[PDB]
């Protein structure tokens, strides 16, 4: 019954799924040459929770969303990194700001420009890095 | 309250929007080197109609959806065609068949695999060709 778009990326790592959330509070991305990890803080059904996916490498970057600020777009690249098909670059855009690009690897681009509605969560595959990423979509 | 993802393509042509449909009955794509047109027969509020977007060129290809068949992916290329930024290649995938690829030109790829839910309508830009395309998403 959900709306899930994706994944883009490789078959490595283990499956992960945040599920949809009515409110995303903050996103923290770790990246070097590629996307090492994504960590999301969200609030739903009366509780706030943080979930970390991917490994321990890369430099951290974080965005704390304002009241009324939501994710409108995700854009990235699927690359070959040391023979592994993973996420090499990622950007998230809100109705107010651009968060990214992080990572430095380009290959096969993907983009989810949400003209109506919002990105409400993430799912994908992960190990030491983010092998694959997808998004939940919800109406505004 | 709708979920619209897109557009991918150029800034030329005129905006068009089919809106979301209860059921997509059939899709006809006209293509040669690039995507000339997309024509959809759809149903909503007990009314079936056909809408054509784009020009009169290219060869036609059609899919008539079986009962229980729905669109679960769209992918293609944004290309440079005679100096215009337009849709050069397009594929629609269902839960049963792959419709396309149509068109001969390559450029920047786009893809919207729907892991959960369906593509329920289209929007875009067009003149003599399909300058840009986007989708409506609904649950299954």
Residue numbers in the entry:
A (entry chain A), B (entry chain B): 3 to 142
Quote the study on this structure.
We demonstrate that a single amino acid substitution, F84T, akin to the H84T mutation and predicted to remove the pi–pi stacking interaction, does indeed decrease mitogenicity while preserving antiviral activity. The F84T mutation in Malay BanLec disrupts pi–pi stacking without significant changes to the overall structure of the monomer or to the dimer. F84T and WT Malay BanLec have an almost identical structure, with an RMSD of 0.424 Å between all atoms. F84T Malay BanLec similarly loses pi–pi stacking (the “mitogenic wall”), but otherwise retains a structure that is almost identical to its parent lectin. We thus conclude that F84T is less mitogenic than is WT Malay BanLec because it likely does not crosslink surface molecules as well. F84T-treated cells also incorporated less BrdU than WT Malay BanLec-treated cells, indicating that F84T is less mitogenic than WT Malay BanLec. Taken together, these studies indicate that F84T induces less proliferation of PBLs, less expression of key cytokines/chemokines from PBMCs, and perhaps less activation of CD4 + PBMCs than WT Malay BanLec, indicating that F84T is less mitogenic than WT Malay BanLec. F84T robustly reduced luciferase activity, indicating that it retained the ability to inhibit HIV infection. As H84T is known to have broad-spectrum antiviral activity, we next sought to characterize whether F84T could inhibit additional viruses that are associated with human disease and are known to express mannose-containing N-glycans on their surfaces.
